[PDB]
Structure formats: structure tokens, C-alpha cells
Amino acid sequence: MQIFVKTLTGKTITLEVEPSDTIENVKAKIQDKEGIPPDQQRLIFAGKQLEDGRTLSDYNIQKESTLHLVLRLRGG
Amino acid sequence: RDYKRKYEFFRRKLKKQNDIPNKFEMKLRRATVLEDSYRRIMGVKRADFLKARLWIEFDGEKGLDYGGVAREWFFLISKEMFNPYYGLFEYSATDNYTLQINPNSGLCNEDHLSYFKFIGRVAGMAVYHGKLLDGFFIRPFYKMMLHKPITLHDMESVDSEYYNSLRWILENDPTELDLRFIIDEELFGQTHQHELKNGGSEIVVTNKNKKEYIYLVIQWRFVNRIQKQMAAFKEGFFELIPQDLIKIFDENELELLMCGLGDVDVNDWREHTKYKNGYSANHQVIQWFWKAVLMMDSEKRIRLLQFVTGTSRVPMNGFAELYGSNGPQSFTVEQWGTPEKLPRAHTCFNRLDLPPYESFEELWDKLQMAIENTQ
User: Fold this and answer.
1) For a Cys staple, B5 with which of B1, B113, B246, B302, CB 3.0–4.6 Å?
2) Measuring CA to CA, which residue among B43, B44, B230 is closest to residue B119?
3) Known catalytic residue: B259?
4) Are residues B159 and B184 in the same domain?
5) CB nearest to A71's CB, from B85, B102, B114
6) Which residues of A touch B83 (CB under 8 A)?
7) A residues 4-63 near B, CB within 8 Å?
8) What is the third-level CATH fold of A1-76?
């Protein structure tokens, strides 16, 4: 299936992924395409942060759906 | 009077600290300048330490001019702080470059407030050490720093459409449109109804209360939602630059004071240079000149730009729009004098009188000596 990942700059990414894929996987797929270390990625779907463990279908994410990417500030 | 007078008075009124080390040390790595700069700077409780001469080293590199390295840091850290990817700042509108505080900073990163104080400190350090940030904020941003009110007109430069939409309501009876005291915003694949006031979902906008409606929309777009963020920034900035002191500038002068480019693009500098009295792009002497400029460091290049223009700050938009004392005067190199003479410059015409030296080395020494003499 096809999903999108909009950035805070307006740039829309397009990923080819399966509903079984974990959030760890999408972050990986995103890393290959936009060159961003997955440990710096925050994914938002329907106002909720997505956890590395769960899969897309765990959040009821289907094709044409849109995730939101945010870069992580390590604070501390 | 004018700006150049205020700035001297300004730098002069900036108290130097006498209870501080003669340097502020930073060991950074370009791949992580943001988190490296954040931890180092946010680690110090007393901001006064940041007034000390900046001693920065990237990736263990040593022996480089302090100023040249500082100039690079302000450029590199700017590119990170102002990266919309972090959700701290964002672009004011579609196809616009100006930066504004992201009202939803707290939803992108919980540590946003301390990072805002960090950006404020960096902005302050920039002004204190006579350096610049790479990026421009919306005008209301500067106005808030000067603690000026944000009115309807301020909207025009930022969101032309929104401004017009409010202009209409101001000039027409909106009653029949059944507008309410709310505003929708979409955020992360969601929509959010926001109350401009208590029970706003019910209150209808009429001719009698549309003035209040306008004012509220302005504040909600520029002031209210970004209250805590702007405060954090101002706290950091004012730890270095006295708030009362910066009130002598207006929004335009303030922008000039803290924003702009540090070093010059040589390829752009070259492409928009004119030659007089026999010289051309391919003339051997000119090829030497541009080779010289090419293998000068950041500090040297600027000292050259100042020796020929009088000022050391580059005009935005490039050299294609360079100005002389009277009208647009392009950067000009003209053949003049004999190899025994040192190059001379006419700042008014942005012109360098460059003798026909017989070798690159000679051109280097002569040019460098002329620049150093008027130092």
C-alpha cells in the first residue's frame, strides 16, 4: 500500500509499505529516502505519536493515509 | 539621527564584564552542532560567561582565526535552530522565507521552552559579539522584542490574504455571514476549534463587535498562542543585551542588527563584477585577483570587501544589486598605476585600482599590505 509522510516544511514524502510493517520499519524506510537517522524521528498519526513496536494496522493506518514527521530535540 | 550612529552608541553602552574569563570555550562537532551547542551554552548558569571572547573549535580543528570560526558557528547553528523540522520555528506562509514561532512547539518537543531560551542566548551572543544570525523573522517578532503592540497592519507583510479578509470585515457588515468568535486550525491530521473568548462558539460577529473580533484574531495569530515561547527567547536574549538599551532601535534597525550574512559568496561576487581600463574576466591579473580572493579565509575576504566598499556587511540579493554612495554602483576593478604602487580603493564607487602585477604572489602581498595599512 501507499502512505505519505508530511514534514513541517510542507514536503510530502511517499512510502511503499505493508500494513504489517512496524513503526521501526517506516522510520527505516524514511531514513533511506530522506537520509534521517530513525532515532531522531517522531511520527504522528491523528494527533498521536507512533511507537516503534506497533505496526501500521495497530493504529488503523491504511493506504492514502498521512503520517506526520517531527525531528526530535534531545533536551535534558 | 541614523543607524550607524545608534550602533556605535549601542556597542559603546554595552558593559564589558570584568568578573569573567578572557575566553568562552566551545568544543563542537558539525554533525551535532545543535545538541553540542545547546548543552554547552545551556550548561552555564551565568550568561555573563558568554560575553567572553568566543573560542570555538569544530571537530578538533586548531590554529584557525577565532572570528572566522565564530562566524561559521553562527551560520551553522542558525541553520539548525531555525530548521522547521524541529517544530520550534516555521515559515510564515507558503513560498515565504521569514520565520515565525510555531505556536504548537510544545507538541513537537516538550523541551521547546529551554531551546527557545537557547536560541535567545545565541541571538544575544550574536549581537554582543557583533556577528549575525542567518535567517529573518516576521516583523511582529521584532516588534514583540521591542515590546510594541501588534495591530492589523502588521498582518499585511506576513499574511496578505488574512489581512485582506480582515480588511473586508472591517469595511463591511458581516452580520449575515453568521461568523462566530472562533477559529479553526488543522494540526497533524486533525482540526481544532479555538475560542477567541469565553463562549466564542456562540457569539456572532456583527458590525458592533467586529472591531473586537479583529483585534482578537490578530493577538491569537501573533501573540497569545506563542506567549511562553517568546518569553523564553526574550529571557535568553536579554541576558546579554539589556532590554532597555535595544529600545533605541525600530523593528527595521533591529532586524539589521541581528540578522544577515557573515561571509560573501565568491562565485556571486565574481559574476557581478565589472572591469575598467583594459581588464576583463579573462585578463591574467584578474584571474590572479579572483584566485587570491578564493584562497583568502573568511576574515580576509571581508577585510577586502570593507577596503573597497567601506562597509563589511554584504547586501542581500547578492552583488547584482550592489549600491554605491550615489545609486547602484557595481563592484569594479580597474587597471591603474605601476607594480611599484599599492592598490587603492574608492569606496564611493566600490572600485579597486589594481596595478598590473607580474605574479600572483606579488598581487597577494601588495593587496594584503594595502588592506593592512588602512586598518
Assistant:
1) B1
2) B230
3) no
4) yes
5) B85
6) 71
7) 7-10, 42, 44-47
8) Ubiquitin-like (UB roll) (3.10.20)
Residues B27, B96 share a domain: yes
Tally of domains in chain B:
3
Quick check: B190 and A69 CB within 8 A?
Answer: no
| Domain CATH for B317 | 3.30.2410.10
- The resolution of the experimental structure, rounded to one decimal in Å, is 2.7
Question: B133 and B99 share a domain?
Answer: yes
Which CATH number does the domain housing residue B38 bear?
A: 3.90.1750.10
Considering the domain architecture, whether residues B8 and B131 belong to the same structural domain is answered as yes
Q: What is the DSSP letter of A32?
A: H
Rounded to the nearest 10°, the torsion over CA B109, B111, B113, B118 is -110
Q: Is the backbone of residue B278 left (phi > 0), alpha (psi -120 to 50) or beta?
A: left
Q: Which residues of chain A neighbour B190 with C-beta distances below 8 Å?
A: 46-47
Q: Are residues B213 and B276 in the same domain?
A: no
- With contacts defined as CB-CB under 8 Å, which chain B residues touch A8? 84-87, 90, 102, 108
> In this complex, do A8 and B87 lie within 8 Å of one another by their Cβ atoms?
yes
Q: Technique behind this structure?
A: X-ray
Enclosing domain of residue B163: 148-225
Query: B333 to each of B273, B281, B286, B344, how far by Cα in Å?
Result: 7, 10, 8, 10
| Domain end point (choices B234, B261, B288) | B261
